Design a binder for this molecule. Structure first.
Ligand code: CA
Ligand code: CA
Ligand code: CA
Ligand code: CA
Ligand code: CA
Ligand code: CA
Ligand code: CA
Ligand code: CA
Ligand code: CA
Ligand code: CA
Ligand code: ZN
Ligand code: ZN
Length: 616
Protein backbone atom coordinates (compact mmCIF):
# COMPACT_ATOMS: atom_id res chain seq x y z
CA UNK A 1 0.00 0.00 0.00
CA UNK A 2 1.07 3.56 -0.69
CA UNK A 3 1.20 4.33 3.05
CA UNK A 4 3.06 1.19 4.17
CA UNK A 5 5.24 2.11 7.13
CA UNK A 6 8.30 0.32 8.59
CA UNK A 7 7.54 -3.41 8.73
CA UNK A 8 3.94 -2.87 9.81
CA UNK A 9 1.46 -4.79 7.69
CA UNK A 10 -0.77 -3.15 5.09
CA UNK A 11 -3.65 -2.92 7.59
CA UNK A 12 -1.68 -1.70 10.63
CA UNK A 13 -0.04 0.94 8.42
CA UNK A 14 -3.48 2.20 7.28
CA UNK A 15 -4.67 2.55 10.89
CA UNK A 16 -1.52 4.52 11.76
CA UNK A 17 -2.02 6.75 8.71
CA UNK A 18 -5.64 7.45 9.61
CA UNK A 19 -4.63 8.44 13.14
CA UNK A 20 -1.83 10.69 11.82
CA UNK A 21 -4.29 12.45 9.54
CA UNK A 22 -6.83 12.88 12.34
CA UNK A 23 -4.40 14.46 14.81
CA UNK A 24 -2.92 16.62 12.01
CA UNK A 25 -6.37 17.98 11.10
CA UNK A 26 -7.01 18.60 14.80
CA UNK A 27 -3.84 20.72 15.11
CA UNK A 28 -5.32 23.25 12.65
CA UNK A 29 -8.64 23.53 14.54
CA UNK A 30 -10.58 23.99 11.28
CA UNK A 31 -8.52 26.95 10.02
CA UNK A 32 -9.44 26.13 6.39
CA UNK A 33 -12.97 24.83 7.01
CA UNK A 34 -14.89 27.89 5.80
CA UNK A 35 -12.53 28.33 2.85
CA UNK A 36 -12.84 24.69 1.79
CA UNK A 37 -16.64 24.85 1.94
CA UNK A 38 -16.66 28.02 -0.20
CA UNK A 39 -14.38 26.31 -2.72
CA UNK A 40 -16.55 23.18 -2.72
CA UNK A 41 -19.71 25.17 -3.40
CA UNK A 42 -18.38 27.85 -5.78
CA UNK A 43 -15.04 26.81 -7.25
CA UNK A 44 -11.72 28.68 -7.22
CA UNK A 45 -12.67 31.68 -9.34
CA UNK A 46 -11.56 34.08 -6.60
CA UNK A 47 -8.30 32.31 -5.92
CA UNK A 48 -6.53 32.20 -2.58
CA UNK A 49 -5.92 35.20 -0.29
CA UNK A 50 -2.42 35.95 1.05
CA UNK A 51 -3.95 36.05 4.54
CA UNK A 52 -4.58 32.29 4.31
CA UNK A 53 -0.93 31.67 3.42
CA UNK A 54 0.26 33.84 6.33
CA UNK A 55 -2.21 32.06 8.65
CA UNK A 56 -0.79 28.69 7.59
CA UNK A 57 2.80 29.89 8.09
CA UNK A 58 2.38 32.05 11.20
CA UNK A 59 -0.67 30.88 13.08
CA UNK A 60 -3.64 32.91 14.20
CA UNK A 61 -5.40 34.57 17.09
CA UNK A 62 -8.04 33.29 17.21
CA UNK A 63 -11.23 31.53 16.61
CA UNK A 64 -12.86 34.14 14.29
CA UNK A 65 -12.97 35.93 10.92
CA UNK A 66 -9.75 36.98 9.18
CA UNK A 67 -10.13 38.86 5.93
CA UNK A 68 -10.21 36.43 3.03
CA UNK A 69 -10.97 33.47 5.19
CA UNK A 70 -14.57 32.51 5.80
CA UNK A 71 -14.99 31.32 9.35
CA UNK A 72 -17.08 28.33 10.33
CA UNK A 73 -18.44 29.44 13.74
CA UNK A 74 -18.40 25.84 15.01
CA UNK A 75 -14.77 25.30 13.90
CA UNK A 76 -13.51 24.43 17.37
CA UNK A 77 -16.15 21.96 18.53
CA UNK A 78 -16.23 20.28 15.11
CA UNK A 79 -12.46 19.73 15.25
CA UNK A 80 -12.49 18.40 18.83
CA UNK A 81 -15.40 16.05 18.15
CA UNK A 82 -13.63 14.76 15.02
CA UNK A 83 -10.37 13.98 16.85
CA UNK A 84 -12.37 12.28 19.62
CA UNK A 85 -14.21 10.19 17.02
CA UNK A 86 -10.77 9.06 15.80
CA UNK A 87 -10.03 7.94 19.39
CA UNK A 88 -8.01 10.89 20.73
CA UNK A 89 -8.32 13.26 23.69
CA UNK A 90 -5.89 16.10 24.51
CA UNK A 91 -3.72 15.40 27.55
CA UNK A 92 -3.67 18.19 30.14
CA UNK A 93 -0.53 19.94 31.41
CA UNK A 94 -1.42 18.61 34.87
CA UNK A 95 -1.42 15.02 33.59
CA UNK A 96 2.05 15.53 32.04
CA UNK A 97 3.46 17.34 35.07
CA UNK A 98 4.19 20.19 32.67
CA UNK A 99 4.79 23.56 34.32
CA UNK A 100 4.33 25.58 31.12
CA UNK A 101 1.58 27.33 29.18
CA UNK A 102 -1.51 25.78 27.61
CA UNK A 103 -4.39 27.72 26.09
CA UNK A 104 -8.17 27.36 26.29
CA UNK A 105 -8.08 24.51 23.68
CA UNK A 106 -5.31 22.71 25.62
CA UNK A 107 -2.66 23.53 22.99
CA UNK A 108 1.01 23.61 24.12
CA UNK A 109 3.41 26.34 22.98
CA UNK A 110 7.11 26.70 22.10
CA UNK A 111 9.68 27.29 24.81
CA UNK A 112 12.53 29.43 23.44
CA UNK A 113 12.88 32.80 21.73
CA UNK A 114 12.00 32.38 18.04
CA UNK A 115 9.61 29.50 18.78
CA UNK A 116 7.12 30.91 21.24
CA UNK A 117 4.28 30.79 18.68
CA UNK A 118 5.04 27.18 17.65
CA UNK A 119 2.23 24.85 18.73
CA UNK A 120 1.81 21.17 19.54
CA UNK A 121 -1.10 18.97 20.54
CA UNK A 122 -0.40 16.06 22.91
CA UNK A 123 -3.20 13.49 22.74
CA UNK A 124 -4.01 10.12 24.27
CA UNK A 125 -5.76 7.07 22.94
CA UNK A 126 -7.27 4.72 25.52
CA UNK A 127 -8.63 1.19 25.64
CA UNK A 128 -12.22 0.43 26.71
CA UNK A 129 -11.06 0.22 30.36
CA UNK A 130 -9.56 3.71 30.15
CA UNK A 131 -5.90 2.67 30.09
CA UNK A 132 -3.62 4.79 27.92
CA UNK A 133 -2.41 2.78 24.94
CA UNK A 134 -0.98 5.41 22.55
CA UNK A 135 0.25 9.01 22.60
CA UNK A 136 -0.14 11.35 19.62
CA UNK A 137 2.07 14.37 19.07
CA UNK A 138 0.72 16.75 16.41
CA UNK A 139 2.95 19.68 15.57
CA UNK A 140 1.49 22.93 14.30
CA UNK A 141 4.66 24.66 13.14
CA UNK A 142 5.07 28.39 12.70
CA UNK A 143 7.69 30.45 10.88
CA UNK A 144 8.55 32.75 13.78
CA UNK A 145 6.94 36.07 14.76
CA UNK A 146 3.68 36.62 12.80
CA UNK A 147 4.55 40.29 12.39
CA UNK A 148 7.44 39.39 10.03
CA UNK A 149 5.14 37.82 7.43
CA UNK A 150 3.81 41.17 6.14
CA UNK A 151 7.07 43.19 6.18
CA UNK A 152 7.80 42.20 2.55
CA UNK A 153 5.85 40.93 -0.46
CA UNK A 154 4.38 37.47 0.18
CA UNK A 155 6.70 35.95 -2.47
CA UNK A 156 9.81 37.47 -0.88
CA UNK A 157 8.63 36.24 2.55
CA UNK A 158 8.20 32.65 1.29
CA UNK A 159 11.52 32.75 -0.59
CA UNK A 160 13.40 33.98 2.48
CA UNK A 161 11.75 31.40 4.76
CA UNK A 162 12.75 28.52 2.47
CA UNK A 163 16.34 29.77 2.27
CA UNK A 164 16.59 29.96 6.07
CA UNK A 165 15.46 26.39 6.88
CA UNK A 166 18.77 24.75 5.94
CA UNK A 167 21.56 26.98 7.30
CA UNK A 168 22.83 26.37 10.86
CA UNK A 169 20.53 23.32 11.18
CA UNK A 170 17.43 25.46 11.75
CA UNK A 171 14.91 22.90 10.46
CA UNK A 172 16.80 19.95 11.95
CA UNK A 173 16.90 21.44 15.45
CA UNK A 174 13.43 23.03 15.39
CA UNK A 175 11.67 20.60 17.76
CA UNK A 176 14.58 20.50 20.24
CA UNK A 177 14.43 24.30 20.52
CA UNK A 178 10.66 24.60 20.60
CA UNK A 179 9.63 21.58 22.67
CA UNK A 180 12.74 20.07 24.28
CA UNK A 181 11.38 20.24 27.82
CA UNK A 182 7.79 19.27 27.03
CA UNK A 183 9.07 16.15 25.30
CA UNK A 184 10.96 15.15 28.46
CA UNK A 185 7.62 15.37 30.31
CA UNK A 186 6.03 13.24 27.59
CA UNK A 187 8.75 10.56 28.12
CA UNK A 188 8.03 10.43 31.85
CA UNK A 189 4.26 10.30 31.26
CA UNK A 190 4.63 7.52 28.68
CA UNK A 191 6.82 5.49 31.07
CA UNK A 192 4.39 6.03 33.98
CA UNK A 193 1.70 4.43 31.81
CA UNK A 194 3.85 1.53 30.60
CA UNK A 195 4.31 2.89 27.08
CA UNK A 196 7.55 2.96 25.09
CA UNK A 197 8.62 4.93 22.00
CA UNK A 198 6.82 2.54 19.65
CA UNK A 199 3.53 3.66 21.25
CA UNK A 200 4.00 7.27 20.15
CA UNK A 201 2.69 8.67 16.87
CA UNK A 202 4.16 11.95 15.60
CA UNK A 203 2.47 13.93 12.86
CA UNK A 204 1.74 17.40 11.48
CA UNK A 205 1.30 19.31 8.21
CA UNK A 206 3.36 22.02 6.45
CA UNK A 207 5.72 23.58 9.02
CA UNK A 208 4.24 20.96 11.35
CA UNK A 209 5.57 18.41 8.83
CA UNK A 210 8.94 20.15 9.03
CA UNK A 211 8.62 19.63 12.81
CA UNK A 212 7.93 15.90 12.39
CA UNK A 213 11.13 15.56 10.33
CA UNK A 214 13.04 17.55 12.96
CA UNK A 215 11.88 15.37 15.82
CA UNK A 216 12.87 12.26 13.86
CA UNK A 217 16.34 13.74 13.22
CA UNK A 218 16.76 14.48 16.95
CA UNK A 219 15.22 11.27 18.27
CA UNK A 220 18.44 9.25 18.17
CA UNK A 221 20.24 11.67 20.48
CA UNK A 222 17.73 13.63 22.58
CA UNK A 223 15.20 12.47 25.22
CA UNK A 224 17.47 9.50 26.00
CA UNK A 225 16.61 8.03 22.60
CA UNK A 226 13.09 7.26 23.85
CA UNK A 227 11.46 8.38 20.60
CA UNK A 228 13.94 6.68 18.25
CA UNK A 229 11.38 3.92 17.51
CA UNK A 230 8.36 6.23 17.36
CA UNK A 231 6.08 6.50 14.32
CA UNK A 232 6.62 9.58 12.16
CA UNK A 233 4.15 10.52 9.42
CA UNK A 234 4.63 14.05 8.01
CA UNK A 235 2.24 15.81 5.64
CA UNK A 236 3.22 18.39 3.07
CA UNK A 237 6.65 18.95 4.60
CA UNK A 238 9.09 21.20 2.77
CA UNK A 239 11.93 19.18 4.34
CA UNK A 240 12.97 15.54 4.73
CA UNK A 241 14.92 14.15 7.70
CA UNK A 242 18.27 12.34 7.28
CA UNK A 243 16.77 9.31 9.02
CA UNK A 244 14.82 6.39 7.57
CA UNK A 245 12.03 7.04 10.07
CA UNK A 246 9.66 9.50 8.34
CA UNK A 247 6.90 8.76 5.90
CA UNK A 248 6.65 12.06 3.97
CA UNK A 249 3.17 12.17 2.41
CA UNK A 250 2.04 14.99 0.11
CA UNK A 251 0.35 15.93 -3.11
CA UNK A 252 2.69 16.19 -6.11
CA UNK A 253 1.16 19.54 -7.05
CA UNK A 254 1.47 20.97 -3.53
CA UNK A 255 4.27 23.51 -3.99
CA UNK A 256 5.36 23.34 -0.35
CA UNK A 257 5.78 19.56 -0.38
CA UNK A 258 9.43 18.60 -1.03
CA UNK A 259 10.39 22.23 -1.79
CA UNK A 260 13.77 21.56 -0.14
CA UNK A 261 16.27 18.75 -0.73
CA UNK A 262 16.65 17.54 2.84
CA UNK A 263 16.65 21.14 4.04
CA UNK A 264 18.78 22.49 1.17
CA UNK A 265 17.49 25.28 -1.10
CA UNK A 266 18.07 24.34 -4.77
CA UNK A 267 17.30 25.82 -8.19
CA UNK A 268 14.03 23.86 -8.15
CA UNK A 269 12.78 25.09 -4.76
CA UNK A 270 10.79 27.96 -6.28
CA UNK A 271 9.74 25.97 -9.36
CA UNK A 272 8.71 22.38 -9.99
CA UNK A 273 10.51 20.11 -7.52
CA UNK A 274 9.27 16.64 -8.36
CA UNK A 275 12.46 14.57 -8.27
CA UNK A 276 11.91 11.19 -6.58
CA UNK A 277 12.65 11.08 -2.85
CA UNK A 278 13.08 7.88 -0.85
CA UNK A 279 11.03 9.04 2.15
CA UNK A 280 8.24 10.60 0.08
CA UNK A 281 5.11 9.62 -1.85
CA UNK A 282 6.06 11.24 -5.14
CA UNK A 283 3.07 10.83 -7.47
CA UNK A 284 -0.21 11.58 -5.69
CA UNK A 285 -2.06 14.29 -7.64
CA UNK A 286 -4.74 16.55 -6.18
CA UNK A 287 -7.05 16.93 -9.15
CA UNK A 288 -8.54 20.25 -8.09
CA UNK A 289 -9.89 23.27 -10.00
CA UNK A 290 -6.45 24.87 -10.22
CA UNK A 291 -4.75 21.72 -11.53
CA UNK A 292 -7.52 21.27 -14.11
CA UNK A 293 -7.53 24.88 -15.36
CA UNK A 294 -5.75 26.22 -18.43
CA UNK A 295 -6.12 29.78 -17.12
CA UNK A 296 -4.74 28.99 -13.65
CA UNK A 297 -1.66 27.36 -15.15
CA UNK A 298 -0.57 30.16 -17.51
CA UNK A 299 2.13 31.27 -15.06
CA UNK A 300 5.07 28.96 -14.25
CA UNK A 301 4.34 26.71 -11.25
CA UNK A 302 5.94 28.18 -8.12
CA UNK A 303 5.55 28.19 -4.33
CA UNK A 304 6.02 31.98 -4.67
CA UNK A 305 2.70 32.24 -6.51
CA UNK A 306 -0.05 32.09 -3.88
CA UNK A 307 -2.79 30.42 -5.98
CA UNK A 308 -0.69 27.23 -6.19
CA UNK A 309 -1.19 26.88 -2.42
CA UNK A 310 -4.72 25.62 -3.08
CA UNK A 311 -3.11 22.15 -3.19
CA UNK A 312 -1.43 22.64 0.20
CA UNK A 313 -4.67 23.14 2.14
CA UNK A 314 -5.31 20.56 4.88
CA UNK A 315 -9.01 19.76 4.34
CA UNK A 316 -8.27 18.30 0.88
CA UNK A 317 -5.41 16.29 2.40
CA UNK A 318 -7.81 14.73 4.90
CA UNK A 319 -10.70 14.15 2.52
CA UNK A 320 -8.66 13.08 -0.52
CA UNK A 321 -6.22 10.81 1.26
CA UNK A 322 -8.90 9.15 3.36
CA UNK A 323 -10.49 8.17 0.03
CA UNK A 324 -7.17 6.54 -0.87
CA UNK A 325 -7.27 4.65 2.47
CA UNK A 326 -10.82 3.48 1.67
CA UNK A 327 -10.07 2.46 -1.93
CA UNK A 328 -10.82 -1.05 -3.15
CA UNK A 329 -7.50 -0.59 -4.98
CA UNK A 330 -5.51 0.39 -1.89
CA UNK A 331 -3.64 -2.90 -1.53
CA UNK A 332 -2.43 -2.64 -5.16
CA UNK A 333 -0.62 0.62 -4.51
CA UNK A 334 2.93 1.36 -3.40
CA UNK A 335 4.73 4.46 -2.12
CA UNK A 336 5.35 5.97 -5.57
CA UNK A 337 2.18 4.78 -7.36
CA UNK A 338 0.56 7.36 -9.59
CA UNK A 339 -2.71 8.21 -7.82
CA UNK A 340 -5.05 10.92 -9.09
CA UNK A 341 -7.51 12.14 -6.44
CA UNK A 342 -10.76 13.80 -7.57
CA UNK A 343 -10.75 17.10 -5.66
CA UNK A 344 -12.91 19.33 -7.88
CA UNK A 345 -15.41 21.92 -6.72
CA UNK A 346 -19.09 21.15 -7.33
CA UNK A 347 -19.31 23.40 -10.45
CA UNK A 348 -16.10 22.00 -11.97
CA UNK A 349 -17.03 18.37 -11.21
CA UNK A 350 -20.12 18.74 -13.45
CA UNK A 351 -18.09 19.18 -16.63
CA UNK A 352 -14.41 18.38 -15.96
CA UNK A 353 -12.86 14.95 -16.59
CA UNK A 354 -10.58 13.74 -13.81
CA UNK A 355 -7.47 12.45 -15.54
CA UNK A 356 -3.71 12.28 -15.34
CA UNK A 357 -2.66 15.51 -17.06
CA UNK A 358 0.91 14.96 -15.79
CA UNK A 359 1.10 18.74 -15.33
CA UNK A 360 4.10 20.20 -13.45
CA UNK A 361 5.60 16.80 -12.75
CA UNK A 362 8.12 14.29 -14.02
CA UNK A 363 6.67 11.72 -16.43
CA UNK A 364 4.47 9.25 -14.55
CA UNK A 365 5.50 5.60 -14.66
CA UNK A 366 3.45 2.44 -14.21
CA UNK A 367 -0.26 1.92 -13.72
CA UNK A 368 -2.51 4.82 -12.77
CA UNK A 369 -5.13 4.91 -10.00
CA UNK A 370 -7.96 7.43 -10.25
CA UNK A 371 -10.05 7.86 -7.12
CA UNK A 372 -13.47 9.48 -7.45
CA UNK A 373 -15.65 11.37 -4.98
CA UNK A 374 -18.93 10.36 -3.36
CA UNK A 375 -20.72 12.58 -5.90
CA UNK A 376 -21.25 12.21 -9.69
CA UNK A 377 -17.81 12.12 -11.31
CA UNK A 378 -16.47 12.20 -14.86
CA UNK A 379 -13.37 9.99 -14.83
CA UNK A 380 -10.99 9.56 -17.79
CA UNK A 381 -8.32 6.85 -17.86
CA UNK A 382 -5.32 7.03 -20.19
CA UNK A 383 -4.04 4.76 -22.95
CA UNK A 384 -1.93 2.81 -20.45
CA UNK A 385 -3.19 0.66 -17.59
CA UNK A 386 -5.74 2.22 -15.20
CA UNK A 387 -7.63 1.48 -12.01
CA UNK A 388 -10.68 3.74 -11.94
CA UNK A 389 -12.89 4.00 -8.84
CA UNK A 390 -16.17 5.93 -8.94
CA UNK A 391 -17.33 5.43 -5.34
CA UNK A 392 -20.89 6.70 -4.63
CA UNK A 393 -22.75 8.88 -7.11
CA UNK A 394 -23.62 8.28 -10.76
CA UNK A 395 -20.20 8.16 -12.38
CA UNK A 396 -19.24 8.24 -16.05
CA UNK A 397 -15.97 6.65 -17.15
CA UNK A 398 -13.88 6.96 -20.30
CA UNK A 399 -10.61 5.19 -20.93
CA UNK A 400 -8.02 5.45 -23.71
CA UNK A 401 -6.95 1.79 -23.92
CA UNK A 402 -4.72 -0.77 -22.26
CA UNK A 403 -5.70 -3.05 -19.38
CA UNK A 404 -7.99 -1.63 -16.72
CA UNK A 405 -10.21 -2.28 -13.74
CA UNK A 406 -13.22 0.03 -13.54
CA UNK A 407 -15.31 0.02 -10.37
CA UNK A 408 -18.60 1.88 -10.65
CA UNK A 409 -19.38 1.62 -6.92
CA UNK A 410 -22.83 2.64 -5.67
CA UNK A 411 -25.17 4.51 -8.04
CA UNK A 412 -26.07 4.24 -11.72
CA UNK A 413 -22.75 4.21 -13.52
CA UNK A 414 -21.78 4.45 -17.19
CA UNK A 415 -18.81 3.45 -19.32
CA UNK A 416 -18.58 5.64 -22.42
CA UNK A 417 -16.52 3.79 -25.04
CA UNK A 418 -16.59 6.70 -27.56
CA UNK A 419 -16.42 4.22 -30.48
CA UNK A 420 -18.70 1.70 -32.18
CA UNK A 421 -19.96 -1.33 -30.26
CA UNK A 422 -18.68 -3.26 -33.30
CA UNK A 423 -15.04 -2.65 -32.30
CA UNK A 424 -15.47 -4.34 -28.89
CA UNK A 425 -16.01 -7.79 -27.43
CA UNK A 426 -17.97 -8.27 -24.22
CA UNK A 427 -17.93 -11.17 -21.79
CA UNK A 428 -19.60 -11.77 -18.44
CA UNK A 429 -18.79 -14.34 -15.74
CA UNK A 430 -22.18 -14.12 -13.99
CA UNK A 431 -20.28 -13.12 -10.83
CA UNK A 432 -20.62 -9.38 -11.45
CA UNK A 433 -17.66 -8.90 -13.78
CA UNK A 434 -18.28 -7.48 -17.24
CA UNK A 435 -15.16 -7.78 -19.40
CA UNK A 436 -14.69 -5.31 -22.24
CA UNK A 437 -12.02 -6.08 -24.86
CA UNK A 438 -11.01 -3.43 -27.39
CA UNK A 439 -9.88 -3.95 -31.01
CA UNK A 440 -6.22 -3.95 -29.90
CA UNK A 441 -6.87 -6.63 -27.27
CA UNK A 442 -6.86 -4.42 -24.16
CA UNK A 443 -9.20 -5.74 -21.48
CA UNK A 444 -11.15 -3.79 -18.87
CA UNK A 445 -12.66 -5.71 -15.98
CA UNK A 446 -15.72 -3.75 -14.85
CA UNK A 447 -18.10 -3.96 -11.91
CA UNK A 448 -21.28 -2.02 -11.11
CA UNK A 449 -21.45 -0.41 -14.53
CA UNK A 450 -25.01 -0.88 -15.78
CA UNK A 451 -24.86 1.29 -18.91
CA UNK A 452 -22.44 1.23 -21.84
CA UNK A 453 -22.39 4.19 -24.24
CA UNK A 454 -21.08 3.71 -27.77
CA UNK A 455 -20.61 6.18 -30.64
CA UNK A 456 -21.97 4.82 -33.90
CA UNK A 457 -20.76 6.21 -37.26
CA UNK A 458 -23.64 4.42 -38.99
CA UNK A 459 -27.11 3.31 -37.98
CA UNK A 460 -26.53 0.44 -35.61
CA UNK A 461 -28.84 -2.39 -36.63
CA UNK A 462 -30.19 0.08 -39.16
CA UNK A 463 -31.75 2.00 -36.25
CA UNK A 464 -29.42 4.11 -34.07
CA UNK A 465 -26.61 6.50 -35.05
CA UNK A 466 -24.26 8.63 -32.88
CA UNK A 467 -24.46 8.05 -29.10
CA UNK A 468 -26.16 4.76 -28.18
CA UNK A 469 -26.86 3.65 -24.58
CA UNK A 470 -26.83 -0.12 -23.97
CA UNK A 471 -28.09 -1.75 -20.77
CA UNK A 472 -25.84 -4.42 -19.21
CA UNK A 473 -27.96 -7.56 -18.68
CA UNK A 474 -27.43 -11.29 -18.05
CA UNK A 475 -28.19 -12.01 -21.73
CA UNK A 476 -25.98 -9.29 -23.24
CA UNK A 477 -26.01 -5.54 -23.89
CA UNK A 478 -29.57 -4.42 -24.62
CA UNK A 479 -31.08 -1.55 -26.58
CA UNK A 480 -34.82 -2.24 -26.32
CA UNK A 481 -35.21 -5.65 -27.97
CA UNK A 482 -31.82 -5.52 -29.72
CA UNK A 483 -29.02 -7.52 -28.06
CA UNK A 484 -25.26 -7.46 -28.47
CA UNK A 485 -24.39 -10.97 -27.29
CA UNK A 486 -21.55 -11.84 -24.94
CA UNK A 487 -18.67 -13.80 -26.32
CA UNK A 488 -19.00 -17.63 -26.15
CA UNK A 489 -18.30 -18.80 -22.61
CA UNK A 490 -18.27 -21.77 -20.27
CA UNK A 491 -19.03 -20.86 -16.64
CA UNK A 492 -18.11 -23.03 -13.66
CA UNK A 493 -19.22 -22.95 -10.03
CA UNK A 494 -17.54 -21.94 -6.79
CA UNK A 495 -16.50 -25.56 -6.33
CA UNK A 496 -13.92 -27.54 -8.33
CA UNK A 497 -14.94 -27.78 -12.01
CA UNK A 498 -13.64 -29.19 -15.24
CA UNK A 499 -14.60 -26.83 -18.07
CA UNK A 500 -14.04 -27.62 -21.74
CA UNK A 501 -13.77 -24.99 -24.47
CA UNK A 502 -15.47 -25.60 -27.81
CA UNK A 503 -13.37 -25.57 -30.97
CA UNK A 504 -14.49 -22.02 -31.84
CA UNK A 505 -12.90 -20.61 -28.67
CA UNK A 506 -14.46 -19.75 -25.32
CA UNK A 507 -14.01 -17.57 -22.28
CA UNK A 508 -13.58 -20.13 -19.50
CA UNK A 509 -14.68 -18.84 -16.09
CA UNK A 510 -13.58 -21.18 -13.31
CA UNK A 511 -14.78 -18.97 -10.44
CA UNK A 512 -13.83 -20.16 -6.92
CA UNK A 513 -12.29 -23.59 -6.26
CA UNK A 514 -9.45 -25.50 -7.89
CA UNK A 515 -10.51 -25.78 -11.50
CA UNK A 516 -9.38 -27.77 -14.55
CA UNK A 517 -9.81 -25.59 -17.65
CA UNK A 518 -9.34 -27.47 -20.92
CA UNK A 519 -8.87 -25.11 -23.82
CA UNK A 520 -9.41 -26.15 -27.42
CA UNK A 521 -7.76 -25.44 -30.75
CA UNK A 522 -9.50 -22.06 -30.79
CA UNK A 523 -8.60 -18.76 -29.17
CA UNK A 524 -9.67 -19.07 -25.55
CA UNK A 525 -9.62 -16.65 -22.62
CA UNK A 526 -8.84 -18.42 -19.34
CA UNK A 527 -10.07 -16.88 -16.11
CA UNK A 528 -9.21 -19.43 -13.43
CA UNK A 529 -10.40 -17.10 -10.68
CA UNK A 530 -9.78 -17.84 -7.02
CA UNK A 531 -8.29 -21.23 -6.19
CA UNK A 532 -5.43 -23.15 -7.75
CA UNK A 533 -6.38 -23.70 -11.36
CA UNK A 534 -4.88 -25.97 -14.01
CA UNK A 535 -5.33 -24.35 -17.42
CA UNK A 536 -4.45 -26.09 -20.70
CA UNK A 537 -4.16 -23.99 -23.87
CA UNK A 538 -5.21 -26.72 -26.30
CA UNK A 539 -3.78 -24.70 -29.22
CA UNK A 540 -4.61 -21.33 -30.78
CA UNK A 541 -3.80 -17.83 -29.55
CA UNK A 542 -4.96 -17.88 -25.93
CA UNK A 543 -5.19 -15.29 -23.17
CA UNK A 544 -4.79 -16.13 -19.46
CA UNK A 545 -6.18 -13.46 -17.13
CA UNK A 546 -5.16 -13.10 -13.48
CA UNK A 547 -6.82 -10.72 -11.02
CA UNK A 548 -6.92 -10.34 -7.24
CA UNK A 549 -5.83 -13.17 -4.96
CA UNK A 550 -5.67 -15.56 -7.89
CA UNK A 551 -3.97 -18.51 -6.16
CA UNK A 552 -1.30 -20.92 -7.42
CA UNK A 553 -2.11 -21.66 -11.04
CA UNK A 554 -0.48 -23.98 -13.57
CA UNK A 555 -0.57 -23.10 -17.27
CA UNK A 556 0.09 -25.88 -19.78
CA UNK A 557 0.82 -25.44 -23.48
CA UNK A 558 1.84 -21.77 -23.37
CA UNK A 559 3.41 -20.67 -26.66
CA UNK A 560 4.72 -17.36 -28.08
CA UNK A 561 1.36 -16.31 -29.56
CA UNK A 562 -0.36 -16.61 -26.18
CA UNK A 563 -0.64 -13.89 -23.56
CA UNK A 564 -0.65 -13.63 -19.77
CA UNK A 565 -2.43 -10.63 -18.29
CA UNK A 566 -1.85 -9.64 -14.68
CA UNK A 567 -4.34 -6.98 -13.69
CA UNK A 568 -5.07 -5.90 -10.11
CA UNK A 569 -2.53 -8.28 -8.57
CA UNK A 570 -0.14 -8.03 -5.61
CA UNK A 571 3.49 -6.93 -5.54
CA UNK A 572 3.64 -4.84 -8.73
CA UNK A 573 6.01 -1.89 -8.42
CA UNK A 574 5.59 0.95 -10.95
CA UNK A 575 6.76 -0.20 -14.36
CA UNK A 576 7.72 -3.76 -13.26
CA UNK A 577 8.12 -6.20 -16.14
CA UNK A 578 7.85 -10.00 -15.96
CA UNK A 579 11.53 -10.51 -15.16
CA UNK A 580 11.04 -8.80 -11.79
CA UNK A 581 8.59 -11.59 -10.97
CA UNK A 582 10.13 -14.61 -12.70
CA UNK A 583 12.27 -17.57 -11.69
CA UNK A 584 12.85 -21.16 -12.81
CA UNK A 585 11.75 -24.11 -10.71
CA UNK A 586 13.00 -27.25 -12.44
CA UNK A 587 11.74 -27.13 -16.04
CA UNK A 588 9.04 -24.51 -15.35
CA UNK A 589 8.97 -20.72 -15.24
CA UNK A 590 7.25 -19.42 -12.10
CA UNK A 591 5.83 -15.89 -11.87
CA UNK A 592 5.12 -14.65 -8.35
CA UNK A 593 2.84 -11.78 -7.33
CA UNK A 594 2.69 -11.48 -3.57
CA UNK A 595 1.45 -14.87 -2.35
CA UNK A 596 -0.04 -15.82 -5.74
CA UNK A 597 1.80 -17.55 -8.60
CA UNK A 598 1.58 -18.83 -12.16
CA UNK A 599 3.69 -21.82 -13.21
CA UNK A 600 4.32 -22.00 -16.97
CA UNK A 601 4.79 -25.72 -17.25
CA UNK A 602 7.76 -26.74 -19.41
CA UNK A 603 8.59 -23.19 -20.50
CA UNK A 604 12.17 -21.89 -20.18
CA UNK A 605 12.33 -18.33 -18.85
CA UNK A 606 14.75 -17.27 -21.62
CA UNK A 607 12.08 -18.12 -24.24
CA UNK A 608 9.66 -15.47 -22.92
CA UNK A 609 9.01 -11.97 -24.25
CA UNK A 610 7.53 -8.99 -22.36
CA UNK A 611 5.01 -8.53 -25.16
CA UNK A 612 3.41 -11.83 -24.11
CA UNK A 613 3.26 -11.01 -20.40
CA UNK A 614 1.28 -7.93 -19.46
CA UNK A 615 1.98 -6.62 -15.94
CA UNK A 616 -0.55 -3.97 -14.92
CA1 CA B 1 9.44 8.22 -3.34
CA1 CA C 1 5.91 12.95 -9.29
CA1 CA D 1 -18.45 9.24 -7.52
CA1 CA E 1 -20.71 5.33 -8.52
CA1 CA F 1 -6.38 2.76 -19.73
CA1 CA G 1 -14.87 -23.41 -9.84
CA1 CA H 1 -10.84 -21.31 -9.73
CA1 CA I 1 -6.91 -22.63 -27.08
CA1 CA J 1 -0.61 -20.71 -28.54
CA1 CA K 1 -6.58 -19.23 -9.78
ZN1 ZN L 1 -6.53 -1.92 29.47
ZN1 ZN M 1 -6.28 -31.85 -18.17
Amino acid sequence: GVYDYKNFGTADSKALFSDAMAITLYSYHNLDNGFAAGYQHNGFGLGLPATLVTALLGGTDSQGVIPGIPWNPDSEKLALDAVKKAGWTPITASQLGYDGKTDARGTFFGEKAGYTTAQVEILGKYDAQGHLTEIGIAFRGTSGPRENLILDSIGDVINDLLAAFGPKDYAKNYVGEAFGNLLNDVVAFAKANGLSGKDVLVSGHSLGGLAVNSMADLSGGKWGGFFADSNYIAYASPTQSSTDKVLNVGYENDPVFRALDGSTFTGASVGVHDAPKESATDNIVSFNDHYASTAWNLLPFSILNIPTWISHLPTAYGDGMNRIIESKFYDLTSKDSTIIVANLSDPARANTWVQDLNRNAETHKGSTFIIGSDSNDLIQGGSGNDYLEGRAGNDTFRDGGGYNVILGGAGNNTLDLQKSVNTFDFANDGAGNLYVRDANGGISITRDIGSIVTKEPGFLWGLFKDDVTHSVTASGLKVGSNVTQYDASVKGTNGADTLKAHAGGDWLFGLDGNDHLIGGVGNDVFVGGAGNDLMESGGGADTFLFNGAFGQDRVVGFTSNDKLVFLGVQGVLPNDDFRAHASMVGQDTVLKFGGDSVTLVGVALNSLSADGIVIA
